[PDB]
Structure 1
Amino acid sequence: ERPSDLVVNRLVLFVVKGTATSTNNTVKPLILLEELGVPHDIYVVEKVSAPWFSEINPHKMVPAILDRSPDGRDTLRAWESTSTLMYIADAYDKDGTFGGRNVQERSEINNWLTLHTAALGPTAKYWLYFYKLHPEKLPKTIEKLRSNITVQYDILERRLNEPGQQYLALKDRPTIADIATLPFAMKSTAELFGLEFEKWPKLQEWSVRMGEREAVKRAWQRVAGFGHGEKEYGMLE
């Protein structure tokens, strides 16, 4: 039972109204879409609890993607921020600029992408849940999760102090690993966790380097603005 304005004529990225807390995952696919210049629409979901949405993403969160298959026979879906980067890379990164060009590049890209998807990503998600969203305060839990984030930063800092290692996965250029990691390893997010981001210098330098890319800047401007235009919810134009 789909809304009237939801049509998949191309890649549709499902987001929510842009706030300080809401954009950290939805920006990831948006960065890669801007990097490759993939033609896409933005659907701002009013309620992720709406039954029509759980059909797209059964976990009932954003970002989510609908896009018709290469042959046009079926409608593809991608949900979980890591899964949306992997789909966009697969479908639109022809030369593997962000997805990797051979087995050697992909081995590292998947190591560092997966590290974020399994460690920093969920730890930071659980930190924020118990910090704000949980009905009671559990500071012993919150302290241990904060302590685990410093161990993730330690591992990222270690990697970026290896010779000529400008980016997490590859030495030469950024990848879906770097895009997936950035929003949980930059000064604004470090300050939210109550950490001094200066304690991991090569990680901070890397965060600034990624931040100065135009595709990242554009993604940050756009994701903040979604649902503050005259049309608040639904497909945007």
Structure 2
Amino acid sequence: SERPSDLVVNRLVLFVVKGTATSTHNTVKPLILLEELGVPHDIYVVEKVSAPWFSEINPHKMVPAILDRSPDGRDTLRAWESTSTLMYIADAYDKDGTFGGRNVQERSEINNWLTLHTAALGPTAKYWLYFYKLHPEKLPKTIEKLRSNITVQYDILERRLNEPGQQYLALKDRPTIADIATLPFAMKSTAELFGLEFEKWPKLQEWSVRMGEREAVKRAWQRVAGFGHGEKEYGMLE
């Protein structure tokens, strides 16, 4: 179809939906990294991700998605899938690799822990929530297995954060796009949604609190809850 009247690309545009307890856990990831790097950006609140105009931006028809100007400003490019939005923002805006990785060694571990989330906890959590409340019929045995698979992912993260000096998932010294991608599915509130006691993974809990105390993370959680509840319900925010 046609782009809405109010959709223009003068800078990075992050596509989101109306903030709810379960609508923000993927969209908050690129928003954390934008807040961390202080990247100039707009927010577009999509009413319907099923709308044909949106599929042209993200053929998977989900948020988050990004439209941005190419480095020279002549062309517009796109990023979609939360992990891909983190990789794009790091590529375009994190030139000294503070969150992307400064060398092959740092990027090897960042990509390991980022991909572990993208392949395992991320999709498992998405399937858990889908079967738990979106699938027309309730399938408790499938829901229970997916819940059990989440505990195995928590076990792997817990083991990593028990290693000497390992303050963050990828690097010892600082948080990376691996930590940002993992945080929304490895914090107390999300653990409680899954029906899990988060205190059973103490180093992972400590890690999640340490991440949550970062000012950029606080600002991202604030803003993502508010999107679509302000003066403008849908479209390009002021």
Q: Assess same fold via TM > 0.5.
A: yes
Corresponding position: 1:227 with 2:233 = no
Deviation for aligned residue 1:73: 2.5
Whole-Å separation in 2 of the counterparts to 1:144 and 1:227: 34
| 1:58-85: CA deviation from partner (whole Å, max 9, x where unpaired) | 0100000000100122111000000000
Which string of whole-angstrom CA distances, capped at 9 and with x for unpartnered residues, describes residues 177-235 of structure 1? 00000000000000011110000000000000000000000000000000111111100
Cα separation, 2, equivalents of 1:23 and 1:82? 14
Map 1:1-40 → 2, pairs under 5 A: 1-40=2-41
Deviations 1:76-107 (A, max 9, x none): 10000000000000000011000000000000
Question: C-alpha separation between the residues in 1 aligned to 2:230 and 2:128?
Answer: 31
Secondary structure of 1:110's aligned partner: helix
Aligned length: 237
Deviation (angstroms), 1:164 = 0.3
Q: Which runs of structure 1 show a deviation greater than 6 angstroms over 4 or more consecutive aligned residues?
A: none
The TM-score normalised by the length of structure 1 is 0.99
- Structure 2 distance, partners of 1:60, 1:104, is 35
Alpha-carbon distance in structure 2 between the residues aligned to 1:19 and 1:195: 21
Is residue 120 from structure 1 mapped to residue 150 from structure 2 by the alignment? Answer: no
Query: Per the alignment, in what secondary structure is the counterpart of residue 203 of structure 1?
Result: helix
Deviations 1:130-184 (A, max 9, x none): 0000001101101110110000000000000000000000000000000000000
1:67 alignment partner, SS class: strand
Deviations 1:44-64 (A, max 9, x none): 001111100000000100000
Looking at structure 1, the residues matched to 75 and 148 of structure 2 have their Cα atoms a distance apart, in angstroms, of 45
Local SS of the residue matching 2:56: helix
- Aligned mates of 1:21, 1:198 — CA distance in 2: 22
TM-score, structure 2 length as denominator?
0.99
| Distance in structure 2 (CA, Å) of the matches to 1:17 and 1:195 | 26
Determine what percentage of the aligned residue pairs are the same residue. 100
Secondary structure of the 2:96 match is coil
Deviation (angstroms), 1:125? 0.1
- RMSD, matched Cα: 0.4
The residue aligned with 1:102 is: 103
Question: Secondary structure of the residue that 2:79 maps to in structure 1?
Answer: strand
Q: Provide the C-alpha distance between the structure 2 equivalents of 1:133 and 1:52, rounded to a whole number of angstroms.
A: 24
Distance in 1 between residues matched to 2:3 and 2:197, nearest whole Å:
46
Q: Aligned partners of 2:166 and 2:100: how far apart in 1?
A: 17
Partner of 1:133: 134
Q: Secondary structure of 2:78's partner? A: strand
Q: Which residue of 1 aligns with 2:197?
A: 196
